[PDB]
């Protein structure tokens, strides 16, 4: 069409992204206890 | 790896167990009495009861 | 006369190797305010 449906609020993305990277981040926390040589947290 | 590490010490642990169990136990029956005499001595040795273990 | 019963050594070592191998098995520490 050319322009587009322009997107005006960017919060949603911001939300989207916010919990992406508090996902990523409990899984690189959780991610060294994975396996045989996987060690223990206190 | 602490896991190489743990498998190390569980192998020493259980190797020198059994070492000791095969060549550097003293049976009491062998010594008598003056054996059980000699033990609370040992124990005792450290302490403030030191010196009198002999009684 | 320097004897100790097999029972202390032998409990010894099997002791301080579980707990050695439990403190060495801790690899991270989360420490929550009260
Ligand atoms: N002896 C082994 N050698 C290689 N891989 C292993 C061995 N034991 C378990 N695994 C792998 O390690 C992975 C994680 O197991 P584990 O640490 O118990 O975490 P989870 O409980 O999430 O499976 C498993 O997917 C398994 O495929
Ligand atoms: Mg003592």
Known sequence: ????????????????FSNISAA?????????????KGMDKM | H???????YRLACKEAVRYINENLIVNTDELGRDC???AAKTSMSSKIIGINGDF | ????????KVKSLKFATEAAITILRIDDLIKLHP
């Open chain 1, 1 to 16: 069409r050319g322009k587009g449906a322009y997107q005006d609020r960017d919060k949603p993305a911001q939300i989207r």
């Open chain 1, 24 to 36: 990523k981040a409990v899984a690189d926390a959780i991610r060294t206890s994975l396996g045989p």
């Open chain 2, 2 to 8: 602490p896991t190489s590490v743990i498998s190390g």
């Open chain 2, 36 to 38: 059980l005499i000699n």
């Open chain 3, 1 to 8: 006369g320097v004897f100790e019963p097999t029972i202390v």
